[PDB]
Symmetry: C3
């Protein structure tokens, strides 16, 4: 909610409180999404200042407060900053910003990152360019310098982040995206490549010196309809764990596909149909193994701009012999959301 607008500066203070619960069978462990209470809240700010008529500064910070821990020792489980960056926007030359922010390949992956609760399985965080990263410098240009309406692009510089863990680390790398939008249609191409850290190189699964990720996207978004499709591939970048062995590393290659179709009724209801499949190839020891495979059915009902409710149902297609240990049971989530 915009709580401040004085002398050039507008501040927006936003957040949500989401009561959420997942119903899986068994112990949750062989199930898609797990099982039990999954409540959380969110809180962030979004500021913007008019430095002059062609020049804007802006900043953003967003945090996640888990709502399913006790008030003892486990208190902080899963609490974290999702976003923290500052930048400048100048007339038709472009914007530039630095900080923790969305990587360039998510410029494509967000097309299908629209289910009520699940989806966007290939857009992991702290995973090079596919979702939120730390340390990126991003340059974005709109409408080709003011010359071609709807033609945009971006380039992004990722700096090395040598963490304690191979999963949350990364060497230096560059990415970019090009996209075009016209009368409800949109098409996108994104691509990035990076160096893998020494600790990444020592993991038992995956071999190579460079991480790579790309995706393509197509969408029709108009007249209350939303249909979208994504297709992408990666070499050495997606995190995988062998649950039998307890080994870990990255998949040599993945070929990913995600399709979504939604409809917005005028009275508040938004049904969703979706399909997802992600498969790893040349996995040291295993061969071709599906990481993700399902059908999704769900609906959201918007009481207004601040209140909503939802059911999200995953008909998991993974099967019970999957060689990595990927679970095969379905999962249902029911949620009630207040936001401002």
């Amino acid at each position: 909610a915009e709580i401040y607008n004085k002398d050039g500066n507008k501040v927006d203070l936003y957040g949500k409180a989401k009561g959420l619960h997942y119903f899986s069978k068994g112990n949750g462990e062989n199930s898609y999404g797990g099982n039990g209470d999954m409540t959380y809240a969110r809180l962030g700010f979004k500021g913007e200042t008019q430095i002059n008529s062609d020049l804007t500064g802006y900043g953003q910070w967003e945090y996640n407060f888990q709502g399913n821990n006790s008030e003892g020792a486990d208190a902080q489980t899963g609490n974290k900053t999702r976003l923290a960056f500052a930048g400048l926007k100048y007339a038709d030359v472009g914007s530039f910003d630095y900080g923790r922010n969305y990587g360039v390949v998510y410029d494509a992956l967000g097309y299908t990152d629209m289910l009520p609760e699940f989806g966007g399985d290939t857009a992991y965080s702290d995973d090079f360019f596919v979702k939120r990263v730390g340390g990126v410098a991003t340059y974005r240009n709109s409408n080709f310098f003011g010359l071609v309406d709807g033609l945009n692009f971006a380039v992004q510089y990722l700096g090395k982040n040598e963490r304690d863990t191979a999963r949350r680390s990364n060497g230096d790398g560059v990415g970019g995206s090009i996209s075009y939008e016209y009368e409800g249609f949109g098409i996108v191409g994104a691509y990035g490549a990076a160096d893998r850290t020494n600790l990444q190189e020592a993991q038992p699964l995956g071999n190579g010196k460079k991480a790579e990720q790309w995706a393509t996207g197509l969408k029709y978004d108009a007249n209350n309809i939303y249909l979208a499709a994504n297709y992408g591939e990666t070499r050495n970048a997606t995190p995988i764990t062998n649950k039998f062995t307890n080994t870990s590393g990255f998949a040599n290659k993945t070929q990913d596909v995600l399709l979504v179709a939604q409809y917005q009724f005028d009275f508040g209801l938004r049904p969703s149909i979706a399909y997802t499949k992600s498969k790893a190839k040349d996995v040291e020891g295993i061969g071709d193994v599906d990481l993700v495979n399902y059908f999704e059915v769900g609906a959201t009902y918007y009481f207004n701009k601040n209140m909503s409710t939802y059911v999200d149902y995953i008909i998991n297609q993974i099967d019970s012999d999957n060689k990595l240990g990927v679970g095969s049971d379905d999962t249902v989530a029911v949620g009630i959301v207040y936001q401002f």
Copy 2:
């Protein structure tokens, strides 16, 4: 403070900064409340949206920031979310909400949960239904569907929370409360029962498969006077530690009593007299042992709605041979509070 009120939505952003210090003797350890700096701050939001004339949505999140840790390694000690939930309120049918929230037996226990700094000793958190829990679904009805003024009730569903620790865990359980209020008098009954987790069952102190808690409350709140009394019992639910042995578990039964009397002067002063006693029965190895036993004397001085100060003095009646290791020295707390 209500910082936002536009188009149906009202947002309230609230918090406090409390400088607090406790004076006990010795090393604090044989003392009621401990000794030294105990400063903290609080911050939360409370949102409400008018979906139509009979229909409201609402949400809440509240956090606790300890103010007595260093800026090193110990930084987060005792930081946590106290509340996180969302819900709907519909005309005279009732409200329903889900999330981390106050359990149903606190509907009774809050009567006496009114001292400046201490008190409400039997209302522990993450302890089934007596204070804040995670994962509860709560249904509350006011004025019996609009038919009887001042007659209210609630039912609450608690879902299993299998944590790392027996103290912060719980199986599934149900509770309810009934209460009546008329011309400054109020009476209440609450009751809940639950399953105990496997890890609870393995603790050395306490035996059984079900946790139970109930309390009764009576109050007179009018003409600046506040008098209130609570009486409750529990089987297998209250956490106890044997300090000699270092063993732990739950008390087989407790019989709890709490009485309070306050007065609100018109110039700002609010004196408080209180009495508290909590005793465990059939404690494996020990027998009947008092957990809590004291007299309280204290005063709060309200400078206004935002500023106040207080002294809270505990004349501890526990004695120096107590068989569980319960401390027996008094404790004094002095505090200065800013809130908005």
Copy 3:
């Protein structure tokens, strides 16, 4: 930003989002400031209530959210409360407040604590009276009871904080400051002494029962110019580590000097020149060793009150044989700041 002003109460909600990166050579380790992403955000509140015409209450809380951790396990690294206190201000008698706050010797040290990114090296936190501490009671008087314009003083009571670590601990102690300001000139004297905890006493470096710190300050702040100088000494209080041995404790004595000169152009640019040196004497095993020694060159460019950018360059004078292990390579920091 002042988001609330109703019925006596004014609330200010403030914060920043700072994209920051340091460029050192090597592995960062033999370098002044280290190397890589160092982004963070900040968020705090500042409240004030008019209790009557001579009487004000106030409170403050401020937090630090690191922006350079992943969304896994390392999530909280370096997150903490910097400030949390409440107090009262009464006409010309003085203010009094309690909580986590700036210690009295920083009344002097802040003179030179003005570089874009670096500086103020002798003002460590949780280090007795030189920067932010926990548990202090502070009394401050302005203009000598209304009698002498510009003559101020303060007394501060520090209570024992027995933490897990010698570095973040402290016994009881008292401090004070006296200062005078006239037509752009200001002079200051601060002094405090404390008891050292048992764990402090057991560290291999440093010997004694009392910690002491003092500093003097001189400044000219007018007509867009800022020149300032600080001189201070400490006995047994500054934390030092021998990097060879891996031993730790406090320096027997330090003689500290800090000088700064800045200029504020009217178009937005603020160049900065600075010099710093801190040296420990009678270090058990070593003798006289420099802890800090450098030259600083930098500039900040203010786009407005909310947006700015900076470069801060440290020409490190420490040398490559330094006996404690102090690094000797330079460091450059580049930052972009949004604040409200």
